[PDB]
Design a protein around this ligand. Structure first.
Ligand SMILES: Nc1ncnc2c1ncn2[C@@H]1O[C@H](COP(=O)(O)OP(=O)(O)O)[C@@H](O)[C@H]1O
Ligand SMILES: [Mg+2]
Lengths: 335, 324
């Protein structure tokens, strides 16, 4: 039996965590959740305590913590403190068209590998002359090399054929040039993988026109934020796509678009699919592959039926009704 | 009658300028041209082009080649501080996004334009970028002014103040002060990533998008991508001393820079945007509608959109323009 840290987060996080626990009980998942709460607190001893819990258990499933951007610059995002402190360097999401969820595009299958620590996320801002905010952001060889290393390895291990580095080296010649040169450095060791590159501006235009061209995409932090949301939008939105944050030793699982969902919370309408699929990625990472598979099949089967859909994908069903159907599908393959 | 500085540029720029001029001729538009050339010379822009634009106060521009950029110089020379890109789905041109009617308003002096990169130590690059209270206030006021003067209901400030607290928060605080004044316009704010997420699901929810340059022009290209690309996207820059330059944002197209295959839609619509900026709404509408009806037909398109040449497409517009 494994022990997994659970951070419920804000918004829809707590309500969906209950359904995760519920689904694990019906699937007889040998996993115990150790809940740690993180307010968007002035204090940090909570975040320090949550980090300890994750170092201890090595694996966490988390909801999103809301960042109040009206607070002063001393108060930083707790999500970002969490992921950078633990050095969870690879944000990876899988956007795949779902047969049951019909969008403006089909045959989408994109793995996005996003560097998760540096760039504007670890930048320094100051106002040394009044009315002038200066931003100092860092990009490094070591971190660019290992994200590229991660992306190529993942491509090879998943039987994928092409890695596209997205960047803006036409403008950011030194920083994004260094990032690109690190990808090429790694590319030379994977001669079986096609390596391409694409400017981030152009990449967005390609995704909304012909997103089927992309296979595995690798990029620094900010462009990852943009590309993740675009790709998640193309396949049906934030309700459907799971996200992973991998370090060398720790791993944390969440919804791909990192949304709190405050506006829809406590109305029994939140789509549980992203969260459940995140819990499945987590089970794979714990080598509980048979459990992950049963559950993943169950949620994919329910989403195949439009009567189960929640309002975010045009449906009229409640969260609890979707969960009911998932549990029904586990039980059918269960015995 | 009024005068417009014309910069045909390189590649297909001449072909498409002659096509635009011919259409403006066939419309009886109160517009004569004053063709000029643009070139970096020792480092600034030609005396004749500067004075032309100082006089005329209004410019139209085709696609240029990169060598100091000429767009950098034009922006520097006339303090072009506000880039405006209206994106509207074209009736005849099929993309999966048909409900699109968005205007992006983008700060155009600082952020990444202020950009300095350098090597801190081996394998570590730092970027330095600036955001000012002044330039934020300036672009904010402009955005509401634009919305009022073009009958636009909502302005959305697009930011990442959750991460860039100091720099995007400043931007946000200057947008709120402007929104306090212009209570007639509906104001909201949205994270860049949420904008992106929602944009590709249902773009009809968005109206005018105001944003700084800190992350660049990425959102404008995305919006353009929804309506069919830079080949059909109009654009305009507004400077100080009532200067305004309208432009295409597509490539120079060297491969067909001598042929008759080109498509002047984008440059045409930027000119349409120019007419509206002057106050020549009647002719603007008629040239605009002529273009759209020509596109809607399906039997007379360029090779990038059927098989018909540029002059056929240009002539078929001219025929429809004359129907007053
Ligand atoms: N699981 C979900 N089901 C349905 N809608 C969701 C879900 N997650 C996010 N959304 C929606 O996507 C948007 C996310 O934005 P938001 O809740 O403000 O997150 P954040 O504060 O982190 O930016 C909202 O419209 C939200 O209702
Ligand atoms: Mg969030």
């Amino acid at each position: 039996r494994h022990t997994v840290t659970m951070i419920p987060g804000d918004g829809i996080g707590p309500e969906l965590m209950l359904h995760v626990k519920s689904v694990f009980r019906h699937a007889c998942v040998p996993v115990d959740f150790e809940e740690v709460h993180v307010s968007s607190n002035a204090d940090e001893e909570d975040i320090r305590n949550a980090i300890m819990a994750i170092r201890r258990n090595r694996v966490a499933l988390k909801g999103n913590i809301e960042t109040n951007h009206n607070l002063p610059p001393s108060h930083k995002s707790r999500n970002n403190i969490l992921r950078t402190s633990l050095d969870l360097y690879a944000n990876v999401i899988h956007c795949k068209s779902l047969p049951g969820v019909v969008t403006r595009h089909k045959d989408i299958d994109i793995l996005i590998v996003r560097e998760n620590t540096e760039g504007e996320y670890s930048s320094l801002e100051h106002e040394s002359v009044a009315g002038v905010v200066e931003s100092l952001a860092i990009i490094t060889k070591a971190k660019s090399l290992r994200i590229a290393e991660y992306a190529f390895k993942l491509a090879q291990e998943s039987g994928r054929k092409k890695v596209t580095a997205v960047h803006k080296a036409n403008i950011m010649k030194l920083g994004d040039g260094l990032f690109l040169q690190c990808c090429r450095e790694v590319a030379a060791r994977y001669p079986q993988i096609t390596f391409e590159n694409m400017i981030v501006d152009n990449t967005t235009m390609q995704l909304v026109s012909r997103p089927q061209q992309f296979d595995v995409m690798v990029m620094p932090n900010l462009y990852g934020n943009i590309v993740n949301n675009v790709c998640a939008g193309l396949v049906g939105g934030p309700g459907l796509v799971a996200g992973a944050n991998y370090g060398h030793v720790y791993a944390v699982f969440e919804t791909a678009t990192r949304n709190t969902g405050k506006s829809i919370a406590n109305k029994n309408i939140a789509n549980p699919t992203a969260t459940l699929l995140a819990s499945c990625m987590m089970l794979d990472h714990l080598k509980l592959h048979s459990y992950a598979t049963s559950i993943r099949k169950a949620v994919l089967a329910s989403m195949d039926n439009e009567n189960m859909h929640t309002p975010d994908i045009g449906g009229q069903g409640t969260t609890s009704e979707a969960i009911q159907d998932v549990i029904r599908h586990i039980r059918v393959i269960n015995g | 009658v009024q005068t417009v500085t014309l910069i045909p540029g390189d590649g297909i720029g001449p072909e498409i300028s002659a096509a635009v001029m011919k259409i403006f001729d066939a419309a009886k538009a109160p517009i004569q041209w004053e063709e000029r050339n643009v070139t970096a010379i020792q480092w600034m822009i030609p005396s004749e082009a500067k004075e032309s634009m100082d006089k005329n106060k209004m410019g139209l521009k085709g696609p240029l080649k990169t060598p100091p950029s000429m767009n950098l110089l034009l922006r520097k020379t006339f303090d072009l501080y506000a880039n405006v890109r209206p994106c509207v789905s074209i009736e005849g041109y099929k993309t999966p996004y048909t409900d699109v009617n968005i205007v992006t308003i983008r700060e155009n002096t600082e952020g990444e334009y202020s950009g300095i990169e350098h090597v801190i130590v081996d394998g570590v690059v730092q970027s330095i970028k600036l955001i000012t209270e002044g330039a934020s206030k300036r672009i904010a006021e402009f955005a509401f002014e634009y919305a009022r003067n073009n009958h636009r209901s909502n302005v959305t400030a697009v930011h990442k103040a959750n991460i860039m607290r100091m720099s995007d928060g400043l931007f946000l605080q200057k947008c709120r002060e402007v929104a306090e004044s212009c209570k007639d316009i509906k104001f909201n704010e949205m994270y860049l990533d949420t904008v992106c997420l929602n944009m590709v699901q249902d773009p009809s929810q968005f109206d005018v998008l105001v944003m700084p340059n800190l992350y660049g022009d990425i959102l404008s290209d995305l919006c353009a991508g929804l309506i069919g690309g830079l080949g059909v996207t109009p654009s305009g820059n507004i400077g100080a001393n009532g200067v305004a330059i309208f432009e295409s944002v597509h490539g120079t197209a060297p491969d067909i820079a001598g042929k008759d295959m080109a498509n002047p839609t984008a440059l045409l619509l930027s000119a349409v945007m120019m007419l509206r900026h002057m106050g020549l709404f009647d002719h603007a509408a008629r040239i605009e509608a002529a273009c759209f009806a020509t596109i809607k037909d399906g039997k007379s398109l360029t090779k990038d959109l059927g098989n018909a040449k540029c002059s056929d497409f240009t002539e078929e517009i001219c025929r429809r323009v004359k129907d007053l």
